[PDB]
Design an enzyme around this catalytic site. Structure first.
Site, PDB file in Angstrom:
ATOM      1  N   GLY A 187       0.810  -1.193   0.000  1.00 42.90           N
ATOM      2  CA  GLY A 187       0.000   0.000   0.000  1.00 42.90           C
ATOM      3  C   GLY A 187       0.851   1.253   0.000  1.00 42.90           C
ATOM      4  O   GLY A 187       2.025   1.242   0.367  1.00 42.90           O
ATOM      5  N   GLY A 225      -0.312  -4.474   0.431  1.00 38.56           N
ATOM      6  CA  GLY A 225      -1.586  -4.499  -0.265  1.00 38.56           C
ATOM      7  C   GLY A 225      -1.642  -5.521  -1.381  1.00 38.56           C
ATOM      8  O   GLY A 225      -2.715  -6.038  -1.699  1.00 38.56           O
ATOM      9  N   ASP A 253      -1.808  -6.185   7.664  1.00 38.64           N
ATOM     10  CA  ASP A 253      -2.946  -5.275   7.603  1.00 38.64           C
ATOM     11  C   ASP A 253      -4.094  -5.743   6.723  1.00 38.64           C
ATOM     12  O   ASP A 253      -5.206  -5.224   6.866  1.00 38.64           O
ATOM     13  CB  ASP A 253      -2.491  -3.899   7.102  1.00 38.64           C
ATOM     14  CG  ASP A 253      -1.537  -3.987   5.931  1.00 38.64           C
ATOM     15  OD1 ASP A 253      -1.352  -5.100   5.396  1.00 38.64           O
ATOM     16  OD2 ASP A 253      -0.968  -2.946   5.547  1.00 38.64           O
TER      17      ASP A 253
END
Ligand SMILES: [Mg+2]
Ligand SMILES: [Mg+2]
Ligand SMILES: [Mg+2]
Ligand SMILES: [Mg+2]
Ligand SMILES: [Mg+2]
Ligand SMILES: [Mg+2]
Ligand SMILES: [Mg+2]
Ligand SMILES: [Mg+2]
Ligand SMILES: [Mg+2]
Ligand SMILES: [Mg+2]
Lengths: 215, 233, 101, 199, 125, 154, 53, 45
Positions: free
Chosen positions: A65, A114, A145
């Site tokens: 990300g 990500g 995450d």
RNA sequence: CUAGAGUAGCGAAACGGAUUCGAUACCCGUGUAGUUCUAGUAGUAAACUAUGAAUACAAUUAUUUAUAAUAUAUAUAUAAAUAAUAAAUGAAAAUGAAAGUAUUCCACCUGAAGAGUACGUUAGCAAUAAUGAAACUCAAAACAAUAGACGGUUACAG
RNA sequence: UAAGAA
């Protein structure tokens, strides 16, 4: 050009991450566009599967990300924008995980942060010789995450009876490359880069044999 | 021949038969073909790169990208008549595969015509099983022939130990001679040592050729005599 | 063979099909519209389950060629709405089907 | 990739050539690479070419020009003769140095016919072989010409021909003689010129 | 224009066969040079037997002195030269062919151009 | 230019008959608008700018220096052993230009033959030119815009 | 679709283009003249052997 | 003529390569920057 | 065809010899006009590729043909033509880069016969050329292909 | 809202 490109292959819908300079780092604009367009494709009766790939094909699929902006959104105290960023990203991950049509992710190149979230939540995730898979959040003071803590304890093949290999991968941030990612279960298939074009055509051709239910 | 429709749609016609009731029992192949669809596009597909040499197919260099005078001193200020012709056919023509080794394979056998007399086996054993280090010429699992010279030459070029292909090729040539002289001396000395210990051979190569020549020459004599007698009459 | 039919009563669109010397012009029709076509085509429609159809035959009006060419017209010169939708990746909606719910 | 393997494949190793397979001029050296097969592959008509060679071919050697042609055949000749000349030369023992320390197409030294170095003696149960004796065939009345071991050589006599020569005439080639191969050089065309003497 | 004349002069004076050809060449060359012309070559071919017994006017010939003359002249004077050649008892056969100068100002005769010497400069080196 | 558009229509039919995946058309505003309408309507798989030799990999800026060597590269679609773009014809021909008002366009879209033009078919696209904008006939009806009925594609 | 189809050539590009085109024409004319003088010289060498008197 | 053309092109390519000194020259002489830079280089010689 | 030259061969017509039941024909002999040239008139042919011109496009192969290279070899690339084709078209024969896909402009056709006739007009020294009807009669008339029959049709065998 | 037949 737009950060995400949407194209058609005869029944499949191709989503190409289109930020080559920043190695396809994922944003809130990117996440929102992907989320809304996948919501559209979930209703279309002429869509059979979604392919996730990158224009910067060899070097990177999605190099994490874009958390530098998240770090500047917090140096200027604009915490609402960071909240929106993570809401978009994680809602997108939840969408991909629970999608009722096949999603195929081409992890051709660096796959981190990500990128793992985009690729780890689908039953069809393809590694190549160029796949460089990692989870490097421990060194930037951040956590796994993208649902990695949910996926890795379940999908990893070796030495994962009590999530301990998942813990090793998460905590150390070791770069797992190519066929090692396939053998560990981080990738579900292993396909050479030169073939991903032909595969993309094939995935665009196949349809359910009859009663046209791609779910 | 027209692109056929009825070979790749056997499932659809069979399912029409089954739905109507014209066919009672589903065939054994039906579910298999339903789960593994045939490819039914049958399109011509363009190509944008020559696989062998990496040349890009389908690029036009613009006049802006030629800002310098050509070999005749003239600048290029407008497209020529070749640039204005659509070159779509080149995108579909199967490209000619080219390798520098082939130019270097032709040279070797022009310089060593009797290396063509060494029989070569074109039946491959297994191309995947080959693990060769071309730092040396002799390889386990290979014969010594022109390809050893040329593979060594290519190795020497890619490691930049030589800059010019000519010098690398000459170096490989001299290594090849070094190995060939050793092999021929080995053969001759082996035969000599064999004879010195009472090896009794039968027909040698020379006697083989003599006997074949005799077999041919008997028939030739008979034909000559018959033809002379016929001519006299 | 299997003949595509729209609503199991007519042909999907219009067909302008040449079979050798026979020029067929077939047109789909509304419900309740009859089979207003050449007699050979009428018999074929009766067997195939086509109820509503308009059309005209030009040039050759040979009965055998009309009969044979109407079947290639039905099978080759028709595309169902599903085929069009999947080929184009678009949604083809029948307005009358949706007007009545 | 497939292209690299094709460049390294055994078919690619055979240099391109289209010289006639039925040449009727002068042969100084081989023109075509001899292709060989094992008995096991020959039993299955397998030669490493595109197409199966016809079963009529019982020999294990051929030469070829084209893998496939508009005539839907491979252009080949089931002949591997030039290897037997070379080996026969190796049996003679007479030697023929550029093998020692932009592109030149001329034949280098011997063109692979022999790599034997000049000065060496052949030990034998009798003793050191002083001179090389070889069977041969006188060809025609002419330095005479002799067919020796697949090569045409120049014959020189001690004093004069014997009566058998003119007794037989043009059938002189039917009988085998013994020759001493004096020497063997090679000329610019690539042709070996052996000088022998009848015995 | 460059022209190549190939005359077949008669030889009636057996003891000096070249006598006629010399005065033919002198006449033609005088005409050319006095009419703003140039003569580049007077290449002599030898005495040769004609393929047939050719009959110019009312006298039959079996051999002739062949000669070639390369000369630069205008079209009108070239036609005049051909006219004089055709009405001369000494000449048996005549022919004038153009040598195109669109490429090179200097060009050798047909004989030297066939031998390989394309221009007079090669022929003088 | 309707002549060039007719040439493009015929060329697209020719390329669909032989099933080439990629072809080129002339580089003009009308050609680009037509190709874009086909691409958005699902008849083309891709639309790229390029040269006479092939589509451009990276952006190449068009100037008078290279205008004569520009092309538009279109990818054709095929599915289930049938071309997606089978037929492509002009309605308004160069020698008979057909300009319709919005009401006649609605009639044409509703099954009425107007000026000998066969009505719109179930899976057909009729394009209309208005103010040098090509657009779908139904879109022109929605915008209440009279225009020149240009071509059918099926 | 947003990009302009054609971008006009700027006055500077036009000036450079005219420079190059004028040079091309001048160079071709000059080379013709040079070969012309060379051929004249090669005739001037062999002009000794040409009869004019 | 040849020298002028070649020098103009070389100078243009050099300035477009190292883009700090082109800014130096733009503020010295007073994507449009490319055309203006070419203008200044062409008047330069 | 009109004038003026020329006219060796060929050769309408004509005159004879044959052949034939008959010969008005084929065959043979003399042979005028014409065929030749100069200046004209005339503007027609199966004047044919029985296929108007232009433009854009469409799958191959093989030959040449002409350029441009590169070192005879690249079985060298780019063009045109030719030959065999794919697809497409077509009543088929077949066409095949047009008889395909399209666009533009022109010419022409609308059952057979009467009829390219009559009448008129225009042009021409004339022969004629162009333009070009209708009444009457009929349910015909034509094209491609199919299978035979036939041929003073071929070849091969027995 | 366009049917053909001998
Ligand atoms: Mg007269
Ligand atoms: Mg006469
Ligand atoms: Mg006569
Ligand atoms: Mg008769
Ligand atoms: Mg007569
Ligand atoms: Mg006239
Ligand atoms: Mg007439
Ligand atoms: Mg006529
Ligand atoms: Mg026709
Ligand atoms: Mg008349």
């Amino acid at each position: 050009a737009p950060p995400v490109l949407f194209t058609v292959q005869d029944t499949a819908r191709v989503i190409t991450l289109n930020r080559p300079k920043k190695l396809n780092a994922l944003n809130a604009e990117m996440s929102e566009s992907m989320f809304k367009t996948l919501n559209e494709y979930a209703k279309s009766d002429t869509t059979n599967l979604v392919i996730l790939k990158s224009s910067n094909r060899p070097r990177s699929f999605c190099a994490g990300g874009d958390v530098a902006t998240v770090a500047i959104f917090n140096f200027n105290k604009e915490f609402a924008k960071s909240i929106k960023f993570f809401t978009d990203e994680y809602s997108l991950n939840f969408q991909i995980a629970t999608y009722l049509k096949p999603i195929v992710t081409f992890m051709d190149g660096i796959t981190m942060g990500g990128g793992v979230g985009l690729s780890i939540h689908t039953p069809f995730r393809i590694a190549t010789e160029n796949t460089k898979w990692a989870m490097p959040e421990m060194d930037i003071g951040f956590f796994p995450d993208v649902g990695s803590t949910f996926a890795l304890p379940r999908i990893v093949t070796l030495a994962n009876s009590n999530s301990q290999m998942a813990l090793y991968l998460c905590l150390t941030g070791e770069v797992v490359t190519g066929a090692d990612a396939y053998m560990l279960g981080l990738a579900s298939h292993y396909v050479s880069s030169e073939n991903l074009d032909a595969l993309q055509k094939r995935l665009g051709e196949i349809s359910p044999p009859f009663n046209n239910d791609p779910q | 021949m027209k692109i056929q429709t009825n070979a790749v749609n056997v499932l659809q016609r069979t399912s029409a038969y089954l739905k109507s009731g014209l066919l009672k029992e589903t065939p054994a192949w039906y579910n298999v073909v339903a789960s593994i669809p045939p490819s039914t596009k049958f399109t011509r597909e363009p190509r944008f790169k020559n696989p062998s040499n990496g040349h890009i197919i389908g690029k036009l260099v613009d006049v802006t990208e030629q800002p310098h005078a050509n070999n005749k001193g003239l600048y290029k200020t407008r497209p020529n008549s070749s640039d204005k012709r659509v070159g779509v056919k080149r995108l579909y023509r199967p490209p000619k595969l080219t390798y520098v080794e082939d130019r270097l394979r032709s040279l070797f056998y022009k310089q060593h015509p009797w290396e063509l007399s060494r029989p070569k086996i074109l039946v491959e054993n297994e191309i995947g099983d080959e693990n060769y280090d071309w730092s040396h010429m002799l390889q386990i699992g290979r014969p010594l022939d022109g390809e050893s010279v040329i593979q060594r030459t290519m190795y020497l070029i890619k490691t930049k130990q030589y800059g010019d292909m000519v010098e690398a090729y000459d170096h490989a040539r001299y290594e090849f001679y070094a190995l060939r002289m050793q092999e021929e001396t080995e053969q001759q000395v082996a035969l000599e040592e064999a004879e010195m210990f009472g090896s009794l051979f039968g027909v040698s190569a020379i006697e083989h050729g003599i006997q074949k020549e005799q077999e041919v020459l008997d028939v030739w004599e008979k034909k000559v005599v018959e033809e002379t007698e016929l001519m006299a009459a | 063979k299997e003949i595509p039919r729209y609503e199991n009563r007519t042909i999907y669109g219009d067909i302008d099909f040449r079979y050798h010397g026979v020029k067929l012009h077939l047109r789909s029709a509304k419900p309740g519209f009859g089979l207003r076509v050449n007699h050979v085509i009428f018999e074929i429609c009766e067997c195939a389950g086509i109820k509503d159809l308009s059309g005209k035959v030009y040039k050759s009006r040979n009965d055998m060629n009309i009969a044979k060419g109407t079947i290639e017209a039905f099978t080759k010169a028709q595309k169902t709405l599903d085929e069009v939708a999947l080929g184009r990746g678009k949604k083809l909606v029948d307005v009358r089907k949706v007007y009545y719910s | 990739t497939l292209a690299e393997l094709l460049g390294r494949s055994r078919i690619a190793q055979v240099a391109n050539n289209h010289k006639p397979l039925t040449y009727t001029g002068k042969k100084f050296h081989p023109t075509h690479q001899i292709i060989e097969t094992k008995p096991s592959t020959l039993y299955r008509q397998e030669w490493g070419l595109k197409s199966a060679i016809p079963s009529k071919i019982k020999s294990r050697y051929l030469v070829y020009n084209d893998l496939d042609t508009l005539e839907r055949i491979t252009t080949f000749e089931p002949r591997g003769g030039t290897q037997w000349n070379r080996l026969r030369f190796q049996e003679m023992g007479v030697p023929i140095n550029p093998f020692f320390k932009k592109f030149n197409t001329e034949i280098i030294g011997t063109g692979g016919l022999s790599y034997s170095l000049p000065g060496k003696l052949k030990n034998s149960p009798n003793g050191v072989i002083q001179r090389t004796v070889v069977p041969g065939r006188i060809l025609n009345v002419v330095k005479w010409l002799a067919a020796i071991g697949g090569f045409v050589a120049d014959v020189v006599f001690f004093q004069s021909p014997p009566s058998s020569f003119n007794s037989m005439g043009d059938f002189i080639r039917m009988k085998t003689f013994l020759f001493e191969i004096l020497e063997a050089s090679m000329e610019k065309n690539g042709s070996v010129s052996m000088h022998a003497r009848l015995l | 224009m460059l022209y190549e004349l190939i005359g077949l002069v008669r030889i009636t004076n057996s003891n000096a066969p070249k006598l006629e050809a010399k005065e033919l060449s002198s006449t033609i060359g005088k005409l050319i040079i006095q009419n703003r012309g140039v003569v580049r070559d007077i290449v002599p071919m030898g005495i040769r037997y004609l393929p047939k017994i050719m009959k110019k006017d009312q006298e039959k010939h079996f051999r002739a002195y062949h000669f070639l003359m390369l000369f630069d002249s205008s079209a009108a004077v070239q036609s005049e030269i051909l006219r004089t050649l055709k009405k001369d008892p000494r000449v048996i056969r005549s022919s004038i062919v153009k040598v195109d100068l669109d490429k090179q100002l200097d060009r050798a005769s047909s004989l030297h151009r066939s031998l390989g010497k394309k221009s007079i400069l090669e022929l003088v080196n | 230019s309707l002549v060039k558009l007719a040439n493009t229509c015929a060329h697209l039919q020719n390329c669909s008959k032989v099933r080439v995946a990629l072809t080129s058309i002339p580089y003009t505003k009308l050609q680009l608008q037509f190709a874009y309408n086909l691409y958005q309507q699902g008849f083309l798989s891709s639309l790229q700018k390029g040269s006479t030799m092939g589509p451009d990999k990276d952006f190449v800026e068009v100037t008078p220096d290279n205008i004569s060597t520009r092309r538009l590269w279109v990818g054709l679609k095929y599915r289930d052993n049938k071309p997606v773009l089978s037929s492509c014809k002009l309605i308004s021909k160069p020698n008979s230009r057909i300009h319709l008002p919005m009401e006649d366009m609605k009639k044409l879209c509703s099954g009425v033959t107007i000026r000998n033009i066969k009505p719109l078919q179930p899976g057909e696209l009729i394009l209309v030119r208005a103010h040098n904008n090509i657009m779908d006939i139904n879109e022109a009806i929605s915008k209440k815009l009279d225009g020149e009925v240009l071509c059918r594609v099926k | 679709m947003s990009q302009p189809l054609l971008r006009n050539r700027s006055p500077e590009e036009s000036e450079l283009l005219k420079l190059k085109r004028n040079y091309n024409r001048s160079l071709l004319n000059f080379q013709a003249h040079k070969k012309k003088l060379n051929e004249l010289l090669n005739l001037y060498h062999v002009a000794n052997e040409f009869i004019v008197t | 003529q040849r020298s002028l053309i070649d020098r103009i092109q070389t100078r243009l390519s050099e300035l477009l390569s190292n883009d700090l000194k082109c800014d130096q020259f733009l503020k010295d002489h007073g994507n449009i920057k490319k055309n203006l830079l070419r203008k200044h280089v062409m008047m330069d010689m």
